[PDB]
Tab-separated table of C-alpha atoms and ligand atoms in Angstrom:
chain	number	residue	atom	x	y	z
A	4	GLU	CA	19.533	26.063	-9.090
A	5	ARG	CA	17.206	26.771	-6.140
A	6	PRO	CA	13.729	27.705	-7.322
A	7	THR	CA	11.911	30.780	-6.027
A	8	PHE	CA	9.613	29.958	-3.104
A	9	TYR	CA	6.474	31.757	-1.971
A	10	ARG	CA	4.706	31.645	1.389
A	11	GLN	CA	1.039	31.321	2.283
A	12	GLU	CA	-0.975	30.301	5.317
A	13	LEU	CA	-3.585	27.624	4.586
A	14	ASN	CA	-5.854	26.589	7.447
A	15	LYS	CA	-3.532	28.075	10.110
A	16	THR	CA	-0.626	26.114	8.552
A	17	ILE	CA	2.388	27.715	6.867
A	18	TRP	CA	3.054	26.534	3.267
A	19	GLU	CA	6.327	27.513	1.529
A	20	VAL	CA	6.513	25.977	-1.950
A	21	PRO	CA	8.251	26.618	-5.271
A	22	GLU	CA	6.484	29.135	-7.639
A	23	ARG	CA	6.133	26.082	-9.894
A	24	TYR	CA	3.132	25.003	-7.768
A	25	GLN	CA	0.114	27.263	-8.110
A	26	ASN	CA	-3.409	27.509	-6.779
A	27	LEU	CA	-2.880	25.482	-3.601
A	28	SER	CA	-6.139	24.208	-2.107
A	29	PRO	CA	-6.452	22.050	1.069
A	30	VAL	CA	-7.865	18.558	0.455
A	31	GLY	CA	-7.762	17.059	3.991
A	32	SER	CA	-5.445	15.737	6.723
A	36	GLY	CA	0.289	15.504	7.567
A	37	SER	CA	-1.825	17.801	5.343
A	38	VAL	CA	-2.346	17.914	1.583
A	39	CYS	CA	-3.060	20.631	-1.003
A	40	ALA	CA	-4.238	20.151	-4.560
A	41	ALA	CA	-1.992	22.323	-6.776
A	42	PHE	CA	-1.383	23.172	-10.391
A	43	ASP	CA	2.107	22.221	-11.581
A	44	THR	CA	2.949	24.983	-14.094
A	45	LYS	CA	6.061	23.036	-15.223
A	46	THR	CA	4.237	19.916	-16.408
A	47	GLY	CA	0.595	20.889	-16.800
A	48	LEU	CA	-0.474	18.199	-14.271
A	49	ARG	CA	-2.756	18.574	-11.259
A	50	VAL	CA	-0.713	17.507	-8.163
A	51	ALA	CA	-1.075	16.643	-4.496
A	52	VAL	CA	1.455	18.466	-2.319
A	53	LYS	CA	1.757	16.809	1.088
A	54	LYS	CA	3.474	18.733	3.890
A	55	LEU	CA	4.682	16.083	6.341
A	56	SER	CA	3.594	16.554	9.973
A	57	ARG	CA	6.465	17.012	12.476
A	58	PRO	CA	8.761	14.858	10.371
A	59	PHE	CA	11.581	14.962	12.954
A	60	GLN	CA	9.522	14.997	16.225
A	61	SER	CA	11.019	11.793	17.515
A	62	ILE	CA	13.049	8.850	16.234
A	63	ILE	CA	9.894	7.072	15.027
A	64	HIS	CA	8.775	10.129	12.985
A	65	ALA	CA	12.285	10.794	11.561
A	66	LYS	CA	12.711	7.173	10.580
A	67	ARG	CA	9.215	7.146	9.041
A	68	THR	CA	10.007	10.315	7.116
A	69	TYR	CA	13.282	8.834	5.792
A	70	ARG	CA	11.626	5.507	4.874
A	71	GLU	CA	8.711	7.050	3.032
A	72	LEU	CA	10.996	9.386	1.073
A	73	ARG	CA	13.403	6.557	0.131
A	74	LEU	CA	10.618	4.181	-0.859
A	75	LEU	CA	8.748	6.710	-2.981
A	76	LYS	CA	12.016	7.726	-4.744
A	77	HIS	CA	12.428	4.040	-5.609
A	78	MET	CA	8.907	3.281	-6.961
A	79	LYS	CA	8.740	3.395	-10.805
A	80	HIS	CA	5.730	1.420	-12.034
A	81	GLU	CA	2.338	2.285	-13.564
A	82	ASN	CA	0.393	0.679	-10.728
A	83	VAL	CA	2.356	2.086	-7.800
A	84	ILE	CA	2.466	5.675	-6.569
A	85	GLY	CA	5.498	7.664	-7.807
A	86	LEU	CA	7.253	10.813	-6.588
A	87	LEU	CA	6.918	13.839	-8.903
A	88	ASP	CA	8.987	16.047	-6.603
A	89	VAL	CA	10.250	16.503	-3.071
A	90	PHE	CA	11.283	19.839	-1.668
A	91	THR	CA	12.125	21.789	1.444
A	92	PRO	CA	12.254	25.593	1.719
A	93	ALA	CA	15.554	25.225	3.679
A	94	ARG	CA	18.749	26.326	1.985
A	95	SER	CA	20.889	24.562	4.579
A	96	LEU	CA	20.761	21.422	6.720
A	97	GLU	CA	20.836	23.670	9.778
A	98	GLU	CA	17.516	25.325	8.808
A	99	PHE	CA	15.958	21.971	7.645
A	100	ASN	CA	12.655	21.220	9.389
A	101	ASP	CA	10.010	20.726	6.670
A	102	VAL	CA	9.600	18.139	3.940
A	103	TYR	CA	7.039	18.342	1.126
A	104	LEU	CA	6.180	15.465	-1.175
A	105	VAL	CA	4.544	15.923	-4.591
A	106	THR	CA	2.561	13.196	-6.368
A	107	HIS	CA	-0.185	13.005	-9.067
A	108	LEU	CA	-3.484	14.129	-7.616
A	109	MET	CA	-5.928	11.304	-7.010
A	110	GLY	CA	-9.699	11.465	-7.551
A	111	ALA	CA	-11.260	8.369	-6.068
A	112	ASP	CA	-10.135	5.371	-4.118
A	113	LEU	CA	-11.553	1.853	-4.328
A	114	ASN	CA	-13.554	2.350	-1.122
A	115	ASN	CA	-15.498	5.029	-3.083
A	116	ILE	CA	-15.986	2.901	-6.223
A	117	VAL	CA	-17.174	-0.125	-4.238
A	118	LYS	CA	-19.447	1.881	-1.897
A	119	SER	CA	-20.843	3.880	-4.858
A	120	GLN	CA	-21.227	1.117	-7.456
A	121	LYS	CA	-22.131	-2.426	-8.303
A	122	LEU	CA	-18.994	-3.656	-10.084
A	123	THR	CA	-19.144	-5.868	-13.168
A	124	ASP	CA	-16.976	-8.953	-13.414
A	125	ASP	CA	-15.140	-7.289	-16.366
A	126	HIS	CA	-14.283	-4.262	-14.167
A	127	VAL	CA	-13.153	-6.457	-11.235
A	128	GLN	CA	-10.850	-8.352	-13.658
A	129	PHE	CA	-9.122	-5.164	-14.646
A	130	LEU	CA	-8.760	-3.608	-11.166
A	131	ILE	CA	-7.454	-6.866	-9.462
A	132	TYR	CA	-5.108	-7.348	-12.459
A	133	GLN	CA	-3.557	-3.960	-11.898
A	134	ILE	CA	-3.306	-4.504	-8.116
A	135	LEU	CA	-1.427	-7.799	-8.750
A	136	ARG	CA	0.771	-6.208	-11.391
A	137	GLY	CA	1.899	-3.435	-8.943
A	138	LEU	CA	2.354	-6.084	-6.189
A	139	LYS	CA	4.531	-8.240	-8.411
A	140	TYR	CA	6.768	-5.141	-8.746
A	141	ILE	CA	6.705	-4.186	-5.061
A	142	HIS	CA	7.274	-7.798	-3.958
A	143	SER	CA	10.242	-8.206	-6.318
A	144	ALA	CA	11.989	-5.402	-4.407
A	145	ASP	CA	11.452	-7.523	-1.291
A	146	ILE	CA	8.922	-4.975	0.028
A	147	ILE	CA	5.714	-6.082	1.743
A	148	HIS	CA	2.878	-3.584	1.745
A	149	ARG	CA	1.121	-5.000	4.873
A	150	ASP	CA	-1.736	-2.496	4.702
A	151	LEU	CA	-3.654	-3.199	1.512
A	152	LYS	CA	-7.300	-2.149	1.716
A	153	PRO	CA	-9.586	-0.276	-0.736
A	154	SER	CA	-8.648	3.173	0.564
A	155	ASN	CA	-4.957	2.492	-0.248
A	156	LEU	CA	-5.785	1.954	-3.935
A	157	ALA	CA	-6.351	5.035	-6.075
A	158	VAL	CA	-8.446	4.623	-9.226
A	159	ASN	CA	-8.942	7.344	-11.924
A	160	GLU	CA	-11.703	7.947	-14.477
A	161	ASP	CA	-9.870	5.601	-16.896
A	162	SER	CA	-10.042	2.859	-14.167
A	163	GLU	CA	-6.227	3.015	-13.936
A	164	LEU	CA	-5.139	1.967	-10.461
A	165	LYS	CA	-2.159	2.823	-8.220
A	166	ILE	CA	-1.052	1.203	-4.984
A	167	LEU	CA	-0.242	3.672	-2.226
A	168	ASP	CA	-0.149	3.830	1.602
A	169	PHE	CA	-2.117	6.763	3.141
A	170	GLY	CA	-0.501	5.677	6.422
A	183	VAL	CA	-13.252	0.802	7.677
A	184	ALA	CA	-10.826	-1.357	9.665
A	185	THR	CA	-7.450	-2.456	8.341
A	186	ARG	CA	-7.958	-5.685	10.288
A	187	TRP	CA	-10.735	-6.690	7.891
A	188	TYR	CA	-8.134	-7.235	5.076
A	189	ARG	CA	-5.337	-8.599	7.297
A	190	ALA	CA	-4.010	-12.130	6.871
A	191	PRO	CA	-4.786	-14.535	9.751
A	192	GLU	CA	-1.058	-14.870	10.605
A	193	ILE	CA	-0.857	-11.159	11.504
A	194	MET	CA	-3.947	-11.613	13.693
A	195	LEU	CA	-2.048	-14.405	15.519
A	196	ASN	CA	0.916	-12.011	15.937
A	197	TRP	CA	3.199	-14.241	13.842
A	198	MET	CA	6.894	-13.437	14.353
A	199	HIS	CA	7.782	-13.129	10.690
A	200	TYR	CA	5.431	-13.160	7.747
A	201	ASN	CA	5.584	-13.793	4.006
A	202	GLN	CA	4.917	-11.421	1.039
A	203	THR	CA	1.691	-13.428	0.578
A	204	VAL	CA	0.108	-11.569	3.518
A	205	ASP	CA	-0.585	-9.002	0.746
A	206	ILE	CA	-2.183	-11.719	-1.447
A	207	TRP	CA	-4.614	-12.450	1.417
A	208	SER	CA	-5.607	-8.761	1.390
A	209	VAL	CA	-6.132	-8.717	-2.420
A	210	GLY	CA	-8.432	-11.788	-1.969
A	211	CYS	CA	-10.464	-9.914	0.675
A	212	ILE	CA	-10.621	-6.828	-1.616
A	213	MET	CA	-11.539	-8.871	-4.698
A	214	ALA	CA	-14.311	-10.632	-2.705
A	215	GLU	CA	-15.751	-7.244	-1.673
A	216	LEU	CA	-15.690	-5.954	-5.279
A	217	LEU	CA	-17.587	-9.076	-6.441
A	218	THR	CA	-20.254	-9.036	-3.675
A	219	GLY	CA	-20.359	-5.409	-2.484
A	220	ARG	CA	-19.835	-6.703	1.087
A	221	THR	CA	-16.900	-6.724	3.501
A	222	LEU	CA	-15.778	-10.356	3.471
A	223	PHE	CA	-14.556	-10.511	7.061
A	224	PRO	CA	-15.871	-7.531	9.039
A	225	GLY	CA	-14.338	-8.534	12.417
A	226	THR	CA	-15.169	-6.275	15.399
A	227	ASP	CA	-11.733	-7.143	16.802
A	228	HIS	CA	-8.886	-9.637	16.281
A	229	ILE	CA	-10.271	-12.811	17.860
A	230	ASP	CA	-13.558	-12.151	16.105
A	231	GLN	CA	-11.563	-11.603	12.881
A	232	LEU	CA	-9.980	-15.072	13.213
A	233	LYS	CA	-13.407	-16.581	13.989
A	234	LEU	CA	-14.952	-15.165	10.821
A	235	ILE	CA	-11.962	-16.237	8.710
A	236	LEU	CA	-11.945	-19.809	10.045
A	237	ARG	CA	-15.660	-20.045	9.283
A	238	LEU	CA	-14.931	-19.636	5.573
A	239	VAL	CA	-11.567	-21.389	5.226
A	240	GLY	CA	-11.832	-23.954	8.068
A	241	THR	CA	-9.611	-24.662	11.045
A	242	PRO	CA	-5.940	-25.659	10.396
A	243	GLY	CA	-5.128	-29.208	9.267
A	244	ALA	CA	-2.410	-31.371	10.762
A	245	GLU	CA	-0.029	-30.194	8.008
A	246	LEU	CA	-0.543	-26.595	9.094
A	247	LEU	CA	-0.484	-27.328	12.845
A	248	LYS	CA	3.005	-28.839	12.301
A	249	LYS	CA	4.220	-25.385	11.171
A	250	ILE	CA	3.149	-23.414	14.274
A	251	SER	CA	6.280	-22.439	16.267
A	252	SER	CA	4.387	-20.781	19.105
A	253	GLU	CA	3.446	-23.080	21.990
A	254	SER	CA	0.548	-20.745	22.918
A	255	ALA	CA	-0.831	-20.426	19.340
A	256	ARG	CA	-0.482	-24.209	18.906
A	257	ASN	CA	-2.460	-24.930	22.075
A	258	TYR	CA	-5.191	-22.412	21.134
A	259	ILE	CA	-5.542	-23.918	17.636
A	260	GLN	CA	-5.711	-27.472	19.035
A	261	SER	CA	-8.306	-26.117	21.531
A	262	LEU	CA	-10.740	-25.130	18.759
A	263	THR	CA	-13.857	-27.019	17.810
A	264	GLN	CA	-12.975	-28.107	14.272
A	265	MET	CA	-14.750	-26.247	11.421
A	266	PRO	CA	-14.792	-27.491	7.822
A	267	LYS	CA	-13.470	-25.606	4.828
A	268	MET	CA	-16.388	-24.100	2.932
A	269	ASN	CA	-16.766	-24.468	-0.822
A	270	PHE	CA	-16.365	-20.904	-2.107
A	271	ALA	CA	-18.821	-21.573	-4.984
A	272	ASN	CA	-21.586	-22.078	-2.418
A	273	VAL	CA	-20.539	-18.753	-0.812
A	274	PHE	CA	-19.901	-16.515	-3.794
A	275	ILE	CA	-23.275	-17.349	-5.389
A	276	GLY	CA	-23.526	-15.973	-8.926
A	277	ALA	CA	-19.880	-15.021	-9.270
A	278	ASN	CA	-17.742	-16.027	-12.254
A	279	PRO	CA	-16.294	-19.481	-11.468
A	280	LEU	CA	-12.773	-18.453	-12.535
A	281	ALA	CA	-12.978	-15.549	-10.058
A	282	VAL	CA	-14.098	-18.051	-7.377
A	283	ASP	CA	-11.223	-20.402	-8.273
A	284	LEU	CA	-8.734	-17.530	-7.854
A	285	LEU	CA	-10.246	-16.576	-4.476
A	286	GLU	CA	-9.721	-20.207	-3.420
A	287	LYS	CA	-6.057	-19.772	-4.388
A	288	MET	CA	-5.614	-16.470	-2.474
A	289	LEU	CA	-7.592	-17.213	0.695
A	290	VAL	CA	-5.584	-20.248	1.819
A	291	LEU	CA	-4.705	-20.211	5.523
A	292	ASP	CA	-1.316	-21.794	4.965
A	293	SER	CA	0.693	-18.920	3.535
A	294	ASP	CA	3.232	-21.243	1.860
A	295	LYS	CA	0.318	-22.491	-0.265
A	296	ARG	CA	-1.128	-19.054	-1.233
A	297	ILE	CA	-0.774	-18.069	-4.854
A	298	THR	CA	1.978	-15.405	-5.445
A	299	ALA	CA	1.305	-12.139	-7.337
A	300	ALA	CA	3.388	-13.328	-10.372
A	301	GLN	CA	1.537	-16.720	-10.393
A	302	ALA	CA	-1.822	-14.884	-9.971
A	303	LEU	CA	-1.147	-12.768	-13.079
A	304	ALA	CA	-1.086	-15.987	-15.147
A	305	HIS	CA	-4.413	-17.250	-13.772
A	306	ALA	CA	-7.112	-17.794	-16.489
A	307	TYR	CA	-9.222	-15.095	-14.847
A	308	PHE	CA	-6.788	-12.460	-16.296
A	309	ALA	CA	-6.480	-14.061	-19.770
A	310	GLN	CA	-7.449	-10.741	-21.459
A	311	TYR	CA	-4.931	-8.509	-19.649
A	312	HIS	CA	-2.010	-10.810	-18.810
A	313	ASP	CA	1.150	-9.953	-20.741
A	314	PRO	CA	4.243	-11.638	-19.370
A	315	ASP	CA	6.308	-9.205	-21.475
A	316	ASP	CA	4.770	-6.196	-19.685
A	317	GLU	CA	4.748	-7.120	-15.940
A	318	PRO	CA	8.171	-5.749	-14.848
A	319	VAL	CA	10.102	-6.262	-11.619
A	320	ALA	CA	11.813	-3.613	-9.499
A	321	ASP	CA	15.476	-2.897	-8.923
A	322	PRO	CA	16.672	-4.237	-5.532
A	323	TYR	CA	15.875	-2.049	-2.537
A	324	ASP	CA	18.090	-2.010	0.589
A	325	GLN	CA	15.830	-2.067	3.603
A	326	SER	CA	18.712	-2.205	6.119
A	327	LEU	CA	19.182	1.561	5.872
A	328	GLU	CA	15.823	2.655	7.316
A	329	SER	CA	16.191	0.186	10.192
A	330	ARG	CA	19.399	1.427	11.856
A	331	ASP	CA	19.444	2.887	15.389
A	332	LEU	CA	20.427	6.497	14.823
A	333	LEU	CA	20.039	9.839	16.541
A	334	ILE	CA	17.296	12.282	15.397
A	335	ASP	CA	19.844	14.630	13.833
A	336	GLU	CA	21.361	11.761	11.882
A	337	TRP	CA	18.021	10.685	10.354
A	338	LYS	CA	17.482	14.375	9.669
A	339	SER	CA	20.754	14.761	7.768
A	340	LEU	CA	20.152	11.531	5.863
A	341	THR	CA	16.628	12.701	4.849
A	342	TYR	CA	18.125	16.044	3.694
A	343	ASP	CA	20.590	14.154	1.475
A	344	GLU	CA	17.693	12.188	-0.102
A	345	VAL	CA	15.817	15.466	-0.774
A	346	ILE	CA	18.914	17.067	-2.355
A	347	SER	CA	19.756	14.054	-4.461
A	348	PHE	CA	16.239	13.863	-5.898
A	349	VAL	CA	16.167	13.477	-9.670
A	350	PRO	CA	12.790	14.367	-11.191
A	351	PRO	CA	10.959	12.038	-13.562
A	352	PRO	CA	11.035	12.663	-17.342
A	353	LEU	CA	7.998	14.471	-18.786
A	354	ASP	CA	5.621	12.553	-21.137
A	355	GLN	CA	5.956	14.319	-24.574
B	401	LIG	C1	3.318	6.770	5.655
B	401	LIG	C2	4.250	5.894	4.836
B	401	LIG	C3	5.485	5.503	5.355
B	401	LIG	C4	6.325	4.694	4.586
B	401	LIG	C5	5.931	4.312	3.292
B	401	LIG	C6	4.691	4.695	2.780
B	401	LIG	N1	4.363	4.293	1.556
B	401	LIG	N2	4.538	3.124	1.152
B	401	LIG	C7	4.140	3.013	-0.112
B	401	LIG	C8	4.248	1.696	-0.958
B	401	LIG	C9	4.618	0.454	-0.132
B	401	LIG	C10	2.938	1.441	-1.744
B	401	LIG	C11	5.431	1.933	-1.900
B	401	LIG	C12	3.680	4.221	-0.510
B	401	LIG	C13	3.828	5.039	0.574
B	401	LIG	N3	3.512	6.350	0.689
B	401	LIG	C14	2.448	6.977	0.102
B	401	LIG	O1	1.660	6.406	-0.669
B	401	LIG	N4	2.348	8.290	0.326
B	401	LIG	C15	1.390	9.162	-0.039
B	401	LIG	C16	0.067	8.735	-0.121
B	401	LIG	C17	-0.981	9.624	-0.399
B	401	LIG	C18	-0.746	10.992	-0.597
B	401	LIG	N5	-1.796	11.870	-0.823
B	401	LIG	C19	-2.491	12.123	-1.951
B	401	LIG	N6	-1.966	11.865	-3.162
B	401	LIG	C20	-2.651	12.105	-4.283
B	401	LIG	N7	-3.862	12.645	-4.268
B	401	LIG	C21	-4.457	12.945	-3.088
B	401	LIG	C22	-5.742	13.511	-3.081
B	401	LIG	C23	-6.355	13.822	-1.863
B	401	LIG	C24	-5.703	13.581	-0.653
B	401	LIG	N8	-6.326	13.889	0.501
B	401	LIG	C25	-4.412	13.013	-0.656
B	401	LIG	C26	-3.789	12.699	-1.885
B	401	LIG	C27	0.573	11.428	-0.477
B	401	LIG	C28	1.638	10.534	-0.189
B	401	LIG	C29	3.848	5.492	3.554
B	402	LIG	C1	-6.096	-20.132	13.673
B	402	LIG	C2	-5.670	-19.275	12.482
B	402	LIG	C3	-4.152	-19.104	12.435
B	402	LIG	C4	-3.613	-19.684	11.131
B	402	LIG	C5	-2.321	-19.003	10.725
B	402	LIG	C6	-1.585	-19.859	9.695
B	402	LIG	C7	-1.417	-19.086	8.386
B	402	LIG	C8	0.043	-18.745	8.135
B	402	LIG	O1	0.745	-19.698	7.341
B	402	LIG	C9	2.095	-19.775	7.798
B	402	LIG	O2	2.742	-18.475	7.550
B	402	LIG	C10	4.105	-18.388	8.095
B	402	LIG	C11	4.515	-16.879	8.101
B	402	LIG	O3	5.117	-16.478	6.875
B	402	LIG	C12	5.015	-19.511	7.479
B	402	LIG	O4	6.352	-19.579	8.056
B	402	LIG	C13	4.323	-20.893	7.574
B	402	LIG	O5	5.078	-21.870	6.858
B	402	LIG	C14	2.896	-20.822	7.017
B	402	LIG	O6	2.273	-22.092	7.119
């Protein structure tokens, strides 16, 4: 069933791809070409992974990304159109290519190139939360949500991805404080930071580093209360928190001047320091702010995903063979009609 492959050098890089994919053109940097998919009609991104089996960290990362992308089947989350290698045997297996729908803009472009209406914010944050509900239901935490990880087309349809502007700006305070474990609601923190930026056109917490990032956060939300202090396991974190000059929680309505009050109320529900008290993605979808999009009959959950597999301690050649099996067992999506 093997397709016919053709070779081409593109910016001093070899590219060996099925005939299916035509008119490869580099779009930046592994490395990515825009292509025409003759099978489907669609414009695609073909990403040739960089040194996928260089080391155990690379091989594991390769395996994890392939497995995750094979699992994602939701309108607001990146999906896999195809995965291929030009190898006809495991023994000649060294290259992995991923194929996805080609993206135009990201949300860093739309924010930095527009003044967004409240109506448009409603729709974009809705879709982010709808993809997160799905991702979170598989017990997956994104951990890296920021505008550049959110693709948005000319129809304002949005997809969550991970390309793999500081990330720290959108990171929950518990990750700043190097918390041992963290909750799925770290991602809700990020959405709050993103939503804020879409409403104001400004980075909410542009910390120059991690201590500075905490400082800026605490300025808005206040220093921890005695309920929250009681939940700090770390002796060192606990001392440092108790060492702070107490700051009061700001009223977000006096900060987000001119914004829709329902949008402000939601921000108050997302940007809570205590993560146990943060609104969840599924709860967020039912907030009055999304009254005109929310459809509890069309906000699906994912099948369970076994994370134990990508976390084993295996040799390079074993991750390699496992990745090969995932490539071979790939079943393509159905075409539209
Ligand atoms: C590194 C890594 C490791 C493990 C998992 C991931 N994740 N995780 C996810 C979630 C949690 C959201 C399921 C998604 C991914 N991987 C991912 O999104 N991969 C991806 C992202 C962007 C592209 N690239 C382009 N695509 C579409 N148009 C373009 C147009 C231009 C351009 N330069 C690039 C592109 C290809 C693959 C990522
Ligand atoms: C000084 C700023 C540090 C405040 C960090 C507290 C915010 C995190 O909140 C904490 O998240 C944990 C991780 O999932 C949970 O186990 C705790 O119950 C929760 O209170």
